[PDB]
């Protein structure tokens, strides 16, 4: 032979992968990669984030000072984990705008409580209850002060507190709703109560609502919980003539990266930067199909478990 | 598929090719052979890797948001929150779909274009000593060795040395 | 319009063509004629139909939503609802515009590419018995019948039978 | 002649269509299709959806039991249609958070009312009014009970009701705001009223506001309407000492696909899956430019009806 | 970069070209020269200007909106407003990025396609009197004047007058 | 020589511009244009918009009639500019839902006040204060009327006002919160006040809250500000028995293009169609990176300082 030949061509694989295009819906290429990630390990790694395990306590009960949450004093968290087996074992209470306070304290990241010296003259301090036993005797919340009449009278309370520091102060107070019209006058000689808490720019006035409620742990009275924020240079004034659950100090308010998450997954000692209510998931892929609630540097939640991007040419086998 | 090289005038692929993505295969007077071309494969790999690592880098970091699961029925605020969430999800899923749909088409078309570019370069090298047989191969009308095909592969083929012999072979 | 076939080196269209989208038209030694090519037309039709039926399938189903028309002036909630609605409408109209703008360009370019592919295949078939006259037609330098053009149309033209006659006709 | 010729080309049409591209704004192709549908038939087809025509009644009046809406008892709807010619012809009333209750009852899809046996001892039942004539005599709403004093006294009403079923119960009650301070003590001997309705997790207490109002159908008194939801395992307690519009039972609460729509279009016997306030529109196209309020499998509302998609090649005529 | 003309078989650009974007440069028997081609430059400029003035025309006009900066901490309404604003900003930045990323690629590819179209037209004009040297130039096998190159530039080259001389020069 | 040559090529520039593509992140082209605009002149041009400079007054104080804002009577604005050096120098007051009223009056665009003849029989009109001196003597707001007891009694006020025009009317009224229980009975003989303002479709009843507040300009009493809107064909009724800050007329309510903006930039006599709190910015570019608060035909706020669009071919130099 006095000639030659030179053929050109490309490679192919036996099994390729089906992808979608602008024209076709199923076209077979030599290789493809996945965009979604939809598996979790099942555990919550405690590095490099600081996880706090709220075993049998919620955030609000650990804030108020429930006697079975006394291990949570001055807890500093980066992510609070709330379990479903949580319950309350103190005086039955109630919070108007519960979600607002829960999100305000969850994103602050501290339970640091500075005690202050208030002067309540004419009343009896450190009221107790048989529904909130702290030890063998009666008790109450550890961050609140239940004031009642001193002998035969209940004068008009009028306390002040200035803010000379350079941070914000969070005060938590409450009001007591009695059960009958006889126990009102036996604790506060006045037939009607009222609580006013005022700063230089806002004011809150609450009046107790006498009535009967369902029995909870042996009581039909209630407590309503309110809060106030004092900014640097401001002042706080508290006026009352009955039905006051006074504060004992203030919480320090911070700003940063902190949150809260409801999950029933255990905690291990691995390392991961993303946390979902199912556990920690790796973050090597841009998308995820596990949970839409996420903390950290997490991939985005998509609806498609399959989503394939072609990284090769078309597959034309023999 | 816009240039008609892959799945076009090249019938099938080569499953025995494990060195690169594009390559050659010659039939000579001393036997047969096979090799690859690094430049086209490298260009395709670099482009596809650039695209891939372009899309997958992260952009979001959210810490505090709104509530998305409720236990009661309340009214206007809950309705507005659910509407916001539904709108956000529906507007992000469409982008997720369209990005992939566009990029797969562009990847396929560029991996098809690289083959046509290699073919056209190889055609331009063999000036008038070869004829295109229509199925991806060239018929070279002079006689080469295993060292003549390698000069065509590393881009230093000298066409004017075999011109007279090829012209007398192909035209007469 | 990227390949320059339609509205490029082909001056105008054929309004007498009613069988398909692409076709042939020969001028022979026995008269004139006309025909069509099913494969290119079928490829274009399948691609355009796939695209069309890709975009028009439905994705949404909404039952309860927020209020979008009010009879009073109220305040913050109404302002937020109107803002949400305006943002959603403005963000969906842009997608509606961009999808059509991209797909029309891709359709035009693919329907232009099919013509160039058919032309290049027909050129590759007539190896060295034809010359391109620059306006879309080939001058075939040997003498065909009405059965020679049909062998070029159904892809079984044998170039080596007319090679010597064409080479003596075109080069001398 | 010893040669031949073979020309290639494409087809063209005399009139083509102008479309927009990435480069050009007006380019002429051989064919194009529209994706926006901006026409309506004018009527509302009653298949395969179940449409209810609220001719002269709103949803709330058909809920309470207006005497000219007594044909709407236990109406089951898939889409409620509210006309603009609707009016009220009973005791003038008022609903705080009207939109919430309207959307809660509209999306439930039933007016099924189970009557319950409440025991009100010490009061007179079945109060009437001359502004709500049901027949030739005085009347009232058919789902509410107007209690007044029995002879010379009005005791403190305290009723229970437990929920032992496996569905939610909706209770509708109200409070009566009188006109003067003389008609208060002539219907309820107490000089001030109060109504408390409580479950194990919530409570609502309302107090009547004596005052004068504009005359509506011959009256200057008012009624305020409230509602309560009792979940399975819960309990309801009602406490009062005057100004109580008691309930007679509960509505059954469901979850599904149901809604409400304001429209003045007639109803015919065609078949369509989409419904707009202008009538039924076909759903063969992905987009629509008729109304942004829609029910069913409806196309999306766009601002632009000129959206032309090319389905052919470019048009180059002779 | 899909056709391989710019940064492909044309090695570098011409920084001495100030008349247009595309042009010619001939080496004759009477000296050298240079010129430009208005049609390709005009097509590219018109397409790029149409695209540019397509995207930059305005669509929005907003007068009253919601509050976006707060001095207090309040609760649900403020959270929902901040979420709405964050979603809107994040959804518009993605569109801003993707539009530019797509249009730059299309601009580059069309400005690459115009060069290939000009090259292919010039090749189709010189029917069989020229050979492509592989680096962007044509070797014309008959002898032209400064008036022969200008007939090739303004599209009225008559190939059949120099056919016999070129065929005897290139093939023998 | 018996041959020739004809080479083809394109142009290049010495310095080109780096742009991003679908494949590459930095590719050098011959030319590029910017999408963002990230600069401002520093001044607010007063053409062709009508800008009003609220030097030392806010919108609400210019509405009520503060004595140092008496130059703002019947001001017609297209954009109100509020400075940070603004303060109040009259009776200390308070507005529930302040943002709602501020946005309602800001978008109306007028302070046109039509005075009406109310008849208050049995009381003393034109009350004054030493904290709101208008000239050398005591004064008050110019759009409100402070009524007190006339000699020894304070009868029950009961005024009416019909709306026979074809536009909406805005009424601004208030209630006075005293400091002690002695100054209440020395101005209004009744030991408790109440204000009711009612239309045919709504009603507002407010009751004063006696208590002490921080001293502001020498006073510990307060004023709360409310508003009412009367539509054509409606009627307004005012009932009271103490603690009423009566109105003197109504503001005319319009609809159009008007707003408000907080900025400390001076005002010049240039011409610009867009206004940001930094000053006026040109609008030749589609995007801007200066401020997200804008008025007029303004470009959109993006987060990039750089987005470059290629308007040329690729740059391959020698
Ligand atoms: C008004 O009616 C309500 C509803 O019946 C009364 O509430 C009921 O109060 C009694 C108090 O004896 C509760 O009985 C208690 O139940 C608990 C739990 O089993 C038990 O430990 C106590 O020893 C006692 O038997 C009853 O459950 C409760 N009903 C509910 C569900 O509310 C209310 O007392 C009545 N008010 C009056 C007295 O006018
Ligand atoms: C305090 O002012 C109010 C509001 O003006 C007075 O209420 C008015 O009371 C009269 C009593 O007759 C109502 O008259 C009724 O008008 C309707 C409509 O024409 C008519 O059909 C009845 O036959 C009757 O004449 C009047 O409507 C009502 N005001 C409004 C605007 O409805 C009130 O009387 C004044 N103080 C008192 C108690 O004298
Ligand atoms: C209950 O506690 C409050 C809080 O201190 C007492 O209010 C205070 O009353 C005094 C009366 O003189 C106010 O004094 C004024 O202070 C300003 C600021 O220096 C000054 O310019 C005036 O000349 C006057 O001295 C004091 O401001 C006010 N408290 C605050 C924080 O403003 C209130 O008196 C106590 N209850 C009573 C009535 O005893
Ligand atoms: C992650 O956890 C969530 C919540 O527990 C899982 O979601 C539920 O999945 C079950 C089974 O498909 C459904 O019946 C529930 O309705 C889902 N709850 C939702 C969506 O709120 C989810 O499947 C888990 N994912 C993985 C990968 O384990
Ligand atoms: C490109 O390939 C050619 C293959 O022919 C290489 O050339 C040969 O080089 C060897 C080594 O000196 C000589 O003995 C042969 O005579 C050469 N043959 C021909 C036909 O030239 C060449 O070295 C390669 N060049 C590069 C840069 O890789
Ligand atoms: C393709 O077209 C050619 C046209 O030439 C067909 O061939 C001819 O077939 C008839 C039928 O037997 C013969 O009588 C002629 O002599 C043939 N002519 C030539 C030039 O071959 C051919 O059959 C067609 N093939 C297909 C598969 O359609
Ligand atoms: C469908 O009904 C709506 C509401 O009746 C129509 O919308 C109105 O159209 C008129 C005339 O253009 C305008 O004056 C109104 O302001 C519109 N009301 C709105 C937008 O709420 C709409 O035109 C109808 N469409 C069709 C196709 O009949
Ligand atoms: C196109 O270019 C050619 C260059 O050759 C122009 O032609 C020449 O025209 C002059 C003017 O009459 C004559 O003297 C020459 O003899 C011509 N030379 C050739 C080779 O034809 C021609 O006029 C140009 N045409 C247009 C339309 O621009
Ligand atoms: C326009 O004005 C705004 C507000 O004064 C400027 O924004 C601030 O910029 C400084 C310096 O970067 C930051 O410390 C502040 O946090 C910014 N305030 C915000 C974002 O609310 C902005 O820089 C000005 N722009 C120009 C071009 O002058
Ligand atoms: C397909 O691509 C992935 C990365 O995108 C790579 O790890 C894998 O080896 C490729 N497949 C083959 C058969 O090479
Ligand atoms: C919490 O921190 C504060 C400030 O450091 C400190 O005064 C207080 O004692 C701490 N709480 C406990 C449990 O000691
Ligand atoms: C244009 O396309 C539509 C469907 O997309 C088709 O019904 C119609 O017949 C086409 N026009 C022509 C002239 O064929
Ligand atoms: C409505 O349905 C309930 C339960 O089936 C029934 O008890 C009641 O009688 C029905 N209403 C009428 C109008 O009979
Ligand atoms: C680049 O483009 C701009 C307009 O887009 C133009 O003003 C400028 O002159 C161009 N640059 C050069 C070097 O021509
Ligand atoms: C404001 O305009 C009204 C109506 O034109 C007029 O009655 C009133 O007197 C004007 N105010 C002043 C300051 O005169």
């Amino acid at each position: 032979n006095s000639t030659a030949t030179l053929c050109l061509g490309h490679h192919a694989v036996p099994n390729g992968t089906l992808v979608k295009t602008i024209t076709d819906d199923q076209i077979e290429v030599t290789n493809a990669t996945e965009l979604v990630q939809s598996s979790s390990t099942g555990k919550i790694c405690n590095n490099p984030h600081r996880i706090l395990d709220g075993i049998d306590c919620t955030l609000i009960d650990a804030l108020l000072g429930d006697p079975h949450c006394d291990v949570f004093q001055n807890e500093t968290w980066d992510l609070f984990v709330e379990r479903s087996k949580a319950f309350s074992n103190c005086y039955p209470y109630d919070v108007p705008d519960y979600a607002s306070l829960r999100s305000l304290v969850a994103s602050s990241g501290t339970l640091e409580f500075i005690t202050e010296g208030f002067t309540w003259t004419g009343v009896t301090q450190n009221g107790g209850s048989n529904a909130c036993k702290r030890g063998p005797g009666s008790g109450f919340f550890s961050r609140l002060n239940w004031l009642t009449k001193s002998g035969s009278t209940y004068p008009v309370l009028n306390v002040t507190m200035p803010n000379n520091d350079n941070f914000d102060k969070l005060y938590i107070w409450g009001i007591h709703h009695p059960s009958t019209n006889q126990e009102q006058t036996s604790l506060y000689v006045q037939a009607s109560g009222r609580v006013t808490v005022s700063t230089r720019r806002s004011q809150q006035t609450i009046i107790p609502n006498i009535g009967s409620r369902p029995w909870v742990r042996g009581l039909s009275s209630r407590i309503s919980i309110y809060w106030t924020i004092v900014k640097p240079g401001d002042v706080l004034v508290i006026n009352s003539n009955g039905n006051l659950i006074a504060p004992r100090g203030y919480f320090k308010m911070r700003t940063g990266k902190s949150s809260i998450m409801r999950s029933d997954a255990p905690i291990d000692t691995c390392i991961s930067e993303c946390i979902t209510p199912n556990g920690s998931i790796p973050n090597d892929k841009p998308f995820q199909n596990v949970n839409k609630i996420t903390y950290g540097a997490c991939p985005k939640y998509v609806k498609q478990n399959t989503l394939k991007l072609a990284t090769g040419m078309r597959n034309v086998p023999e | 598929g816009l240039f008609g090289a892959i799945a076009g005038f090249i019938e099938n692929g080569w499953e025995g090719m494990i060195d690169g993505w594009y390559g050659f295969r010659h039939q000579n007077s001393e036997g047969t052979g096979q090799a690859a071309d690094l430049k086209s494969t490298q260009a395709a790999i670099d482009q596809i890797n650039g695209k891939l690592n372009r899309v997958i880098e992260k952009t979001n970091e959210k810490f505090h948001q709104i509530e998305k699961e409720f236990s009661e029925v309340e009214g206007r605020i809950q309705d507005l929150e659910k509407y916001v969430e539904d709108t956000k999800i529906d507007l992000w899923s469409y982008n997720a779909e369209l990005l992939v749909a566009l990029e797969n088409q562009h990847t396929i078309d560029l991996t098809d274009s690289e083959m046509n570019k290699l073919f056209e370069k190889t055609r331009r090298q063999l000036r008038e000593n070869a004829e295109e047989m229509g199925n991806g191969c060239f018929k070279i009308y002079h006689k080469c060795d295993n060292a003549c095909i390698e000069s065509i592969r590393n881009g230093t083929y000298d066409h004017d040395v075999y011109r007279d012999e090829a012209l007398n072979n192909r035209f007469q």
Side-chain angles (χ1 to χ4, degrees), chain A, chain B:
Chain A
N1 234 4
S2 183
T3 83
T5 309
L6 184 64
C7 298
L8 283 70
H10 56 273
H11 78 147
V13 300
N15 320 338
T17 59
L18 295 174
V19 305
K20 303 189 188 177
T21 59
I22 277 301
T23 70
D24 296 274
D25 195 341
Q26 292 288 264
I27 187 160
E28 183 178 2
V29 298
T30 59
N31 204 16
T33 203
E34 188 68 35
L35 301 205
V36 175
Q37 92 96 83
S38 64
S39 64
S40 64
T41 87
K43 267 81 69 174
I44 297 186
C45 310
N46 60 345
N47 268 125
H49 295 300
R50 179 177 176 98
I51 310 294
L52 194 66
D53 193 7
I55 313 120
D56 287 323
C57 298
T58 49
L59 197 43
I60 299 300
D61 289 345
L63 179 82
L64 292 173
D66 215 283
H68 84 291
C69 312
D70 265 1
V71 306
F72 293 120
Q73 312 209 325
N74 292 27
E75 295 302 320
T76 54
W77 66 87
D78 289 345
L79 179 80
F80 201 92
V81 173
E82 246 175 1
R83 314 300 194 171
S84 37
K85 63 182 185 191
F87 57 94
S88 295
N89 199 256
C90 187
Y91 211 100
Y93 67 96
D94 182 47
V95 188
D97 220 8
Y98 174 90
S100 271
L101 180 58
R102 182 193 180 257
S103 100
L104 181 133
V105 172
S107 83
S108 177
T110 59
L111 284 173
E112 181 190 2
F113 181 83
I114 320 290
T115 205
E116 276 182 336
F118 287 93
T119 302
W120 321 95
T121 180
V123 291
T124 300
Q125 303 190 28
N126 302 313
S129 192
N130 255 287
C132 196
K133 293 179 179 179
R134 185 187 259 89
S138 86
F140 200 68
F141 299 100
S142 74
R143 305 282 186 223
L144 298 169
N145 203 345
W146 191 5
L147 323 160
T148 48
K149 71 171 173 55
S150 147
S152 57
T153 58
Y154 189 107
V156 182
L157 295 174
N158 190 45
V159 296
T160 177
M161 188 56 67
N163 180 13
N164 300 309
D165 293 42
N166 56 94
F167 45 79
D168 301 288
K169 293 179 173 181
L170 176 74
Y171 289 86
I172 310 277
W173 44 281
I175 185 161
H176 178 226
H177 307 293
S179 175
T180 38
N181 223 318
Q182 189 268 6
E183 98 188 33
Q184 163 93 45
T185 54
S186 65
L187 292 174
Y188 331 96
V189 308
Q190 274 81 230
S192 157
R194 172 198 56 88
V195 176
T196 317
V197 177
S198 295
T199 52
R200 278 207 187 108
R201 53 173 183 86
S202 64
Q203 40 156 344
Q204 282 167 285
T205 304
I206 326 287
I207 294 182
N209 306 266
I210 289 96
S212 267
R213 280 97 181 178
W215 261 42
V216 174
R217 286 179 281 282
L219 294 174
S220 64
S221 324
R222 292 295 187 270
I223 291 183
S224 283
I225 299 294
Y226 303 87
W227 75 89
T228 306
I229 300 200
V230 191
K231 296 169 73 175
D234 217 285
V235 174
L236 181 95
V237 181
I238 304 183
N239 202 272
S240 151
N241 64 107
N243 302 95
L244 173 65
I245 311 296
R248 289 184 190 267
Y250 59 92
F251 297 86
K252 290 193 58 179
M253 288 206 61
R254 286 184 158 85
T255 86
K257 62 179 100 180
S258 314
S259 204
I260 191 168
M261 172 174 293
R262 304 187 184 94
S263 174
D264 265 293
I267 294 186
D268 227 345
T269 77
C270 34
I271 293 178
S272 171
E273 268 272 334
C274 174
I275 295 170
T276 70
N278 309 49
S280 284
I281 62 152
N283 52 335
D284 291 83
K285 305 174 187 179
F287 304 115
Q288 146 240 11
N289 192 31
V290 180
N291 220 298
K292 61 181 188 294
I293 309 163
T294 59
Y295 181 82
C298 294
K300 293 179 179 179
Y301 189 76
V302 293
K303 288 141 71 202
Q304 294 300 320
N305 192 31
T306 63
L307 177 63
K308 282 176 167 182
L309 189 76
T311 75
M313 74 182 60
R314 208 190 153 180
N315 200 53
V316 198
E318 268 73 10
Chain B
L2 276 186
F3 298 82
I6 298 188
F9 65 91
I10 293 173
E11 317 273 35
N12 55 268
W14 292 343
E15 285 180 28
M17 169 94 66
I18 45 154
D19 289 345
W21 289 8
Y22 312 99
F24 295 91
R25 171 177 302 186
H26 73 81
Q27 159 77 68
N28 205 349
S29 152
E30 305 163 281
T32 62
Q34 192 184 1
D37 192 30
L38 281 201
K39 293 179 179 179
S40 308
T41 315
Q42 207 52 41
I45 284 182
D46 284 276
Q47 294 300 320
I48 295 178
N49 273 356
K51 157 177 308 186
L52 181 61
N53 293 337
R54 183 100 155 79
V55 302
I56 294 169
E57 293 177 350
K58 191 150 288 330
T59 321
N60 233 359
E61 291 177 85
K62 303 283 155 181
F63 296 116
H64 197 61
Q65 285 150 107
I66 58 169
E67 294 303 315
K68 309 184 186 186
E69 293 195 17
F70 313 88
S71 99
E72 293 177 350
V73 295
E74 178 226 349
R76 296 182 73 171
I77 314 301
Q78 185 168 325
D79 272 271
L80 191 57
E81 293 196 22
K82 293 179 179 179
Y83 194 73
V84 169
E85 189 57 33
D86 289 345
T87 297
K88 182 190 174 182
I89 293 172
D90 275 349
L91 262 165
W92 269 115
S93 311
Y94 171 88
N95 297 341
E97 184 84 27
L98 185 73
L99 188 62
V100 178
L102 281 173
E103 293 177 350
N104 285 334
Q105 188 80 87
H106 189 258
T107 289
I108 290 186
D109 284 339
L110 177 63
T111 58
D112 289 345
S113 167
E114 208 56 48
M115 185 82 248
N116 194 76
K117 272 190 275 194
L118 178 56
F119 181 86
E120 223 58 43
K121 177 171 70 184
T122 306
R123 177 191 64 82
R124 287 187 173 101
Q125 207 169 193
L126 305 149
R127 200 144 145 192
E128 295 262 321
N129 313 340
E131 274 195 31
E132 175 191 7
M133 287 198 303
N135 56 357
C137 312
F138 297 90
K139 188 166 171 57
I140 307 180
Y141 279 95
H142 62 102
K143 146 165 50 157
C144 287
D145 307 0
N146 277 110
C148 180
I149 312 270
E150 196 193 303
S151 34
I152 313 173
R153 283 201 308 252
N154 64 357
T156 169
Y157 182 68
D158 194 304
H159 80 102
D160 209 302
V161 191
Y162 316 94
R163 180 186 184 88
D164 290 295
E165 166 189 12
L167 282 194
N168 187 85
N169 256 317
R170 68 188 289 219
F171 281 157
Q172 294 176 334

